[PDB]
Amino acid sequence: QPKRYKAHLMGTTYVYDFPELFRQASSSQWKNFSADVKLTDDFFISNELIEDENGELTEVEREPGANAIGMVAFKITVKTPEYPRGRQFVVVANDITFKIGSFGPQEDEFFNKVTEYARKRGIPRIYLAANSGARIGMAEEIVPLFQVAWNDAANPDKGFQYLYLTSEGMETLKKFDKENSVLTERTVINGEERFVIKTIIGSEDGLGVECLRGSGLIAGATSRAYHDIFTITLVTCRSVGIGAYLVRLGQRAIQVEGQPIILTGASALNKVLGREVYTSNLQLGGTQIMYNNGVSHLTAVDDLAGVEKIVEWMSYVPAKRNMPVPILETKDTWDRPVDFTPTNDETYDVRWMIEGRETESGFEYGLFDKGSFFETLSGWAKGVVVGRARLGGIPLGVIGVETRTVENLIPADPANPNSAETLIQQAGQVWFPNSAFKTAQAINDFNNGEQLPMMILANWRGFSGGQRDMFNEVLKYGSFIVDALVDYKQPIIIYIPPTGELRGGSWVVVDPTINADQMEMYADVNARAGVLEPEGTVEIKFRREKLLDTMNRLDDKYRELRSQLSNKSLAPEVHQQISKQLADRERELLPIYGQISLQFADLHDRSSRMVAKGVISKELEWTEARRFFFWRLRRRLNEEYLIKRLSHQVGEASRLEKIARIRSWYPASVDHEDDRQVATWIEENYKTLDDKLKGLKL
Amino acid sequence: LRPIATPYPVKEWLQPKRYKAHLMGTTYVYDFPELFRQASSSQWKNFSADVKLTDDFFISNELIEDENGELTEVEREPGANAIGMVAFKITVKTPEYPRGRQFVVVANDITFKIGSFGPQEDEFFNKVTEYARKRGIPRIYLAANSGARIGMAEEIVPLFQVAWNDAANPDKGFQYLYLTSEGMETLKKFDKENSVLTERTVINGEERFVIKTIIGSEDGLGVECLRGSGLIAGATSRAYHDIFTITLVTCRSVGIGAYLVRLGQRAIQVEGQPIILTGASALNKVLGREVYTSNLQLGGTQIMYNNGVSHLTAVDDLAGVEKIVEWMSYVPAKRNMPVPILETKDTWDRPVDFTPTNDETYDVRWMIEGRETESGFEYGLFDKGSFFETLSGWAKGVVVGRARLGGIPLGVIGVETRTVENLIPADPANPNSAETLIQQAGQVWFPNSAFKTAQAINDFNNGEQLPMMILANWRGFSGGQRDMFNEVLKYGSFIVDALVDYKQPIIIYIPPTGELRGGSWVVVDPTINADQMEMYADVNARAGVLEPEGTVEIKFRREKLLDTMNRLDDKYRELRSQLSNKQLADRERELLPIYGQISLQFADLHDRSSRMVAKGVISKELEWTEARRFFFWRLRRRLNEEYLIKRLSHQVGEASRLEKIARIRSWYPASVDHEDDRQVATWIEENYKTLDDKLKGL
Ligand SMILES: CC(C)n1ncc2c1C(=O)CC1(CCN(C(=O)c3ccc4n[nH]cc4c3)CC1)C2
Ligand SMILES: CC(C)n1ncc2c1C(=O)CC1(CCN(C(=O)c3ccc4n[nH]cc4c3)CC1)C2
């Protein structure tokens, strides 16, 4: 087919061939899960969506390439490892072979209809971006008709005053039913009628501002969809203007290498700048721009690799809005200790704590299921590690802290000849503007559409408080974290891991009182927390007077010298010498007594003080954290389900009232603090509990 | 005494705490209500010089917690506060509320444990925030603090022993800290057994209770202060979406204090009062070098006002209190009350005097508030003297503020047409760093001005609950490499989100000489929020996908132009008629400059407000000089209709907005032309009591 080769020439897959790529990715998903599984054709179904007589979207079986508009959609029903009976989603895509995949009023109204269709059903919306932005046009019927009112008809270079139509021109339009193509004002010059052109409208739709209204409509539709359903974009060919905005508005984006995300093309920018500044569109919106700045969460070598990453990302996501998170137990089961353990005297990659580490003596298992970590936003603000993982089969969002110094290259500005590339270095365990933004972005993306619970392996000394980072608005990005947590609707676990810490500046944005309905905090037996690091605490609270008071209690020499000063019959020069001896003993003891004060301060910063103060739920041992967190998260998910069931019944009541009612239904011998017992009893009694919900609503 | 022989009592002697606050460079907390009294009095003097105020116009009652922990109004002597956080309920008669408006003022007491936040200050701050939230009244926070309270277990300081490696040489180190049986007995005697966690050991035949953790009997030492920080961080994030929130930085604001400034969003920073996370000295200790010289270098106004954290600066505390009171004058007395009308001598019924031209430079502030000329004052769109600019130190490419339109308050966003430049300071931590001057072209959205725009939309919406006018004048977004790398797409997408969330009437008006193109129209189209938005374009505005040069470059090429030369130039036509049977390619050279101007005008003729009206993308095209008269009645009419929509929400359960306005508009009589804004607003206002009665019940 010529349309297929036209798409290939543009560097993309022809739209009607994308469902087959989804079929291949879904088949590969089964092969990776269980090699022995035998798939039948019924495992994957793709039905095209088109508008019926009433303009309502409906599933149809028609020949491919029969689209009368540059936007197409498919409803996919697939049987997957997490949904063996089937899950559904919608795929919207521009047709790059239809008026260069430009967005006209009809493409925008169809895109909006498709977004609303997925939203109404609670199903994910996948967008395949391959376009040229808003459709551009002119009134072509006016091009061979317009006349010029010259200042001097003998000298054209003396200028013109206006453009006009003759009575013949007006008659041509009337004949063709195009009177409304122009707004004219009648005048008479040289005994001839001149219909001065006041505005050009055009009979053809899709020339200008109507395309722009459509752009705004779908920009708004996508902003709304992101809060409602799982949204993702694959940048499969260039994405321009509204197209670039749609990739960001859907938030989750996979960019095929060599496919740019642009606002204005390099050539047009060169025309406005009046010089050859930019060489390509890729220099403006390639992966080295968008993956590095977090607009693109992931890159793909080609379209199939991109479809594979979509399907893999979706494997952590509920089949539709408000369905439970999809459990997918693998051979790495919950009942094992954690093997990889970080130490303060050896450098580690957080990823080893998350997913485990392959060693010479075999695999060292991490907190989460082996092979389950799906890292995203990996090209941007690498000081924080974000991804999806599974805990004994339970999917969740994970935020970890990169302890190693991170460096990023800011490119030389081609528009500034005085500009050179800059290497920025950011210390580990510190939130900077970019990593604070990444953290808040990750919280939002796990919450909206994905509806995942979350674990944050909290390990920050604080925020970067230096001049550059303060000027670069670190306070704004840190505040986004608080907002993102207030909005969170699934269980959250804040866990200060072994070697980890939280201080005055970092604890403020992760404390469970930010969102008491969802959050809970735990600290490892080898974690630390306090307002300041011990060097800061002793500077405020273990000052010279306390240091001297300790020396007087604990040092024989200092105490002896100090007591000699109680003698009221001393010669002044003897007093001066023993007071000089005292001050010399202070100088001698100041370093080691300083170290004692640091140990004294450090002893307050322990998980045992956190437990005693009631600021953490429990102190934990790292090796046992997988076992503990699996049952805690399993129990919370069960309880959250019951809370929501009670919400749909007996009207309005507070969250505290709702769980207290649910927990009153547990056998009296059930210990509310025993997570495994609670989760087990709920699961053995879901149907009995369902009768209680329907009954105790009389 | 000091000083002796003053005519009146020495207030700093009667309350030494007042002197202590002054020594810190700030107003004593208990003296802030008097500053509010002075600012409120000055507000009346500025409104109407002849108004005579009595003491009853202003009342400040301190709020304290009763026996049950409930906030209650009290009259007590200054400095009686048992905690470092104080609050006042203010009832003032103002020009916009002559019968009175109320608000709450929360403030740290810098004299009470250096204004540190302990669990009690945090729980009081939260109680005060909730009190204002429950009443719908504004919450003003006066920040003068040292962040989270830091402490140590003072009862352990004179008891702890050191297990030396060699008791004769302290410098050889120690192993641990311990208590003797006597030390353990001292604690038991004082009911402080729970102050430490110890492990019993025997060394040299003597019991040693090795200190495993220090807890302390005293509250407010560490992590409990951090839980309190998180609580009030979350409380403030919530309050911002609910009530008008503002912060005055009256002395330093540290850690949680810095975060509270940002979480309340609106902030006024007194010059010389820093907003900091970690102090300069502590940062020098961590860096191991003398990098920073002061806290002001990290969080002074040249940092926070230049980056938008501080919306405004103030020369002193009173100037700050004046700016709060002025900002509040545009804000409803409490949540959901109508926006406060304040008509001045500049009434609605006049044309607009200042008009921009296409060939001359202007300050958009002249279009907004007017311009003082040699021949007298040229009135702008809004009431003379009513423009209150905010975020004026940051991203100056966009102009943000509150204004009044015939007395109606609203948020205004305008576009700075002149090139803006900002100085990025040299990073003192990088010796290879130098200050950089960035220049940004006018009428272009860059990362900083796109962020400012979204921030302004949010701040007018939440708490202020103001309607808004955007004088839309952007060519697009900066699509160049630097700005794309600096995530312009992210900041532009915030604009869409901010508009989706907007709950009051919005007017998008492309003013004379103004424009919107493909990239800029996408984020302001009224289909983003059809319930609140409407767009208008001036008769001298422009809009299309690309600028004329862009449209001709693809739709009016060097072949369509030659077909135009053949049709319109007698000389060109004749040479082409001859060849039809090197010389013709010379008439082109002559005609090229003027035919290019003609093709450009052909394209420009499509970009008019008349095409926008014909396409149905704008409500009306308008004439600038008549815009004040038009917008006053349009906004007055919309506010009235919005008020009736909300009143109809208090009736017959749930019904759609479209159903609600259709019902309301069905009540208008035959004499009232629906399209006549003045007639509709007038009829609603005359029949509001009758409608109020008729509605209950109906
Ligand atoms: C330079 C910057 C990139 N940075 N590196 C690392 C960090 C930073 C920050 O900005 C914040 C941070 C928070 C924790 N912290 C203290 O608690 C602290 C406070 C007072 C002190 N006195 N003596 C040493 C002290 C350490 C030290 C400073 C950590
Ligand atoms: C360099 C940058 C800071 N900048 N300055 C100003 C702007 C920018 C942008 O990035 C976006 C902008 C949008 C409007 N625009 C066109 O519609 C356009 C498009 C194609 C053309 N071909 N010939 C001239 C053209 C003008 C030109 C480019 C405006």
Swiss-Prot record, chain A:
Location of region: Carboxyltransferase: 1-648
Localization per Swiss-Prot or TrEMBL: Cytoplasm; Endoplasmic reticulum membrane
Induction summary: Repressed in presence of fatty acids. Repressed 3-fold by lipid precursors, inositol and choline, and also controlled by regulatory factors INO2, INO4 and OPI1.
Function: Carries out three functions: biotin carboxyl carrier protein, biotin carboxylase and carboxyltransferase. Involved in the synthesis of very-long-chain fatty acid synthesis which is required to maintain a functional nuclear envelope. Required for acylation and vacuolar membrane association of VAC8 which is necessary to maintain a normal morphology of the vacuole.
Protein name from the UniProt record: Acetyl-CoA carboxylase
Impact noted for substituting residue 543 to E: Affects only slightly binding of Co-A
Domain CoA carboxyltransferase C-terminal: 333-648
Stretches assigned to the CoA carboxyltransferase N-terminal domain: 1-329
List of residues binding CoA: 238, 541, 543
Organism, scientific name: Saccharomyces cerevisiae (strain ATCC 204508 / S288c) (Baker's yeast)
Source taxonomy: Eukaryota, Fungi, Dikarya, Ascomycota, Saccharomycotina
Subunit text: Homodimer.
Binding site for acetyl-CoA: 134-136, 505
Membrane-crossing segments per the record: none
Miscellaneous field: Present with 20200 molecules/cell in log phase SD medium.
